[PDB]
């Protein structure tokens, strides 16, 4: 019998509830998004208010779409983190109440492992080294001895943060996302501008690059020497070169066959094109899922929760806490072994 | 009889009963055969000389400012005495029809010779200007002018007629 | 020149060989030319209509002689009579004749009821307004400048309230006439109940 | 400095115990500036908040009222 | 000498006035809750603005006036009328100040404050007073020791009419929508027909506002007239109508002099037309100025000074603010004595 | 139904009594839906507020904390 685990994802302004089966099929994936004024980042309090407004209708829509009665749900999975405290605590309260009413065990689930496993079951990849690059994460993950160890990551800031900050500097619209506007404006780019080389060892840095390109943007817009399209083109090409170079170095170090990419920032096309070209040069394949899974959602967490529960490892109802950094390596794989 | 009007103008009045050539008078008014300007009114609709004097003042103001809406000043007068905004119906009802042998003939600042020749032109019996109360057709006055019984109990018919003639343009 | 009103003027002249008065609504300068013409025409029509309607209700009013559209003038019959204020001053100074006061109160109450039942307010029922015709002791009403047409009993109650307030303002040297006028209106009117309810409501409003 | 003691009406005892085992087991934001204690007697809650600052206590009030209404709207079906 | 302090918060404007008996303002820090353009004011956010500003505002009033709190003869709050929340904040602060300073609270009406301030500024003894503002369109005459109203809008005030007509046209909101309407009408050149809407001794503006809104919406798309012409025609029509009403008020009570007060008194076309009328009827219009006609604490404090030096007082247990408080309820004991 | 008591510690008895009396005279807009009573003990001002519904309770306590903040600022300015 396909045992069903109900999971939540609220690590960001994206609220989602997930129901999955043993094969990874999503019986219901309702989801809701929060919008922000341009040039600024969302604050936790109004985000939590939005989460409170939308959490009950999301569960209602999940139970309607999946057409699965809550009794048939076998266990409840809550996203331990990482994520903001308020939506995580709202999800924790809801899962605790649902567990107390339905008498189902609770399990804490990580988010990056969820991304990795859902990408694995979607793209059909066997076991690739994964680059997760987004607004909140930028890391290289490889499986080893039951632990999803980190090989490469950003040293100062996730490049998603740098891209969003520069988009705010360029006053680009937040609808549908600053990243998409940046990508389109770079596609309209004509002039390239040099940027500092800030790759230390096999990792990357972006704070100095972001500061330098912000200064360059201010100087060039003040003097009207170029359009923001050229600025976006330069930033895009430079950061793509750095990221693909460190990806190649990690790929050579890890001694793999093919590589997987995931994340909202991974929605770009110039990256996937040139990096798949160099992968074909390196006798490697590109794995790249659709934008539906690159963004956070509940069915993401639900499948990893199912994997954890089927083995037999549980979690006490009192330990349903959260943390600002729920590191991936702290989770020991037992389903694969 | 000649009675004075405003700004020194005068008007000559002549009431005739038993008019035998009323059809000829109407035909002459239609074709304009008669050279002298004259207006013929159904004299049964007149209680006093005062409403006629008020209509004369109205026609005098119209002529002085040259605002004669109708082709002639006398036709302006006969339309004025009707108190209605419809010229054709005014001429048909208050102006002489084929059933009016009790006719008033008037002119503006007329010389005695003009009135004498007008009297020669008409085959009727001249009557004074005091029998109107005896010959006033009060029933049709109430019918046409919608004079209420309450109005009659506080004022005379002539006053109501004069008020309506004044207030025609107020509607 | 006899008198100049707040919005118009009244003049003395002769109409059709009869002694006459001329109420001329001369163009005031508080309106723009087209605006002034429009309001002068409309309010002239309204005054003529109010006189016609008050005549239709059996209330004696000055007779309208003639209307000059291109001059904005009202010609009215001249009335010989006595003012109510003079009669009441005589009552206060030389003694109040109770029978004359009762007859006057009954007549004015009947006239007020007759005007009120027609759904047309007056608004200026002041002792300077109504006159009593000499010899015939008949009551006449003038000065329709503030006349407004409405069926609301609020307006009739306000009119009666203003009338009694003016009676109080002109001093009680002739005595208290509120009881007499109320009894006259009761004996004359038919919808007097609602009018007196609203009058009492207005009285409580104004007392505070 | 500032404090409040909610006592809340509930139909059955198990509803009060559900509210206890749901919210109380959760760890609040920061013990340094605020203190929270909660107990259950019969079907009646006794929830005491103590805080240094009224604005922090009011933020806690907002969160607590919202989550309690959430728990009620979850139980009601 | 005698000095009174008054608080005014019945509208979005907030004022803390401190006045003497001569009518001279000692200090007047006046602040406004500057709403975003295209939006009005609501009691909750206005109360929040008052919460943030009133203590700095009171401190500024004390610094500007340099008058010790003990020198206050009476502390007076605007009882109303107005929206509940700001009047309620004013009530709390005046209660606290009365119980701390041990000073008498006096409830003060708003229209009485406007009339008294205008009369003391312009030196008039007993004129008909026209108070026109956003929420008030009043013609007022002294009678039997009571300020009896004789001309009043039955539906909506002229100021509110101008305001939401401007919002229909989406005017700016600085310093006031009426000022922007006046600036626009300064370029108006064409007259526009407006129906005759004066009955008795009162005017109605809701029908007038609906008609002018319909005409503006019909003419803007058809480019038949400019918004300047609409504003100019509306201004001239409404002020001619008000001339007629106040002239009827002159006739009924037999009054000669004329006083104008309120926000719209800041304009000049009203003064021109009123002085023309006074010259025609041998009257004497008295002029207006911004600091003595806009909503602030000076007029409130002056009316409170009159009430306190006359004898009337209200105990602290009777500090019951009212959303509705008519002018005639105020027994004008100052003038009879 | 819903209710609690709040405390505030003042410098002396006088400030507690001033806050008590100043907020006491404040009438209640809806006595049929909310109710307030209170006690004073030393410098501790205890306010027992009881409301029927959760949203009304939350709004009432929000306004109550706001007006308490007003009172505290005023007293601290004029201590
Ligand atoms: Fe105001």
Numbering used by the authors:
A (entry chain E): 3 to 339
B (entry chain C): 2 to 172
C (entry chain B): 14 to 221
D (entry chain F): 16 to 92
E (entry chain A): 4 to 340
F (entry chain D): 16 to 94
The paper states:
In archaea and eukaryotes, the evolutionarily conserved KEOPS is composed of four core subunits―Kae1, Bud32, Cgi121 and Pcc1, and a fifth Gon7/Pcc2 that is found in fungi and metazoa. KEOPS cooperates with Sua5/YRDC to catalyze the biosynthesis of tRNA N6-threonylcarbamoyladenosine (t6A), an essential modification needed for fitness of cellular organisms. We show that A. thaliana KEOPS is composed of KAE1, BUD32, CGI121 and PCC1, which adopts a conserved overall arrangement.
Alternatively, a mixture of freshly purified AtKEOPS and AttRNAArgCCU (at a molar ratio of 1:2) was applied to cryo-EM grids for structural analysis. The reconstruction shows six KEOPS subunits―KAE1, PCC1, PCC1, KAE1, BUD32 and CGI121, but no presence of a tRNA molecule. The dissociation of BUD32–CGI121 from KAE1–PCC1 in one KEOPS protomer was probably due to the structural damage at air–water interface during sample preparation. Imposing local refinement, we managed to determine almost a complete structure of AtKEOPS complex with exception for the C-terminal tail of KAE1 (residues 341–353), N-terminal end (residues 1–13) and C-terminal tail (residues 222–226) of BUD32, and N-terminal end of PCC1 (residues 1–15). We modelled a Fe2+ ion in the binding sphere of H113–H117–D298 motif in KAE1 based on crystal structures of Kae1/OSGEP proteins. The final model is composed of a complete AtKEOPS protomer (PCC1–KAE1–BUD32–CGI121) and an incomplete protomer that only contains KAE1–PCC1. In general, the C-lobe of AtBUD32 is located farther away (at least 4 Å) than that of MjBud32 from the C-terminal domain of KAE1. Our structure shows a distance of ∽25 Å between Arg220 of BUD32 and t6A-catalytic site of KAE1.
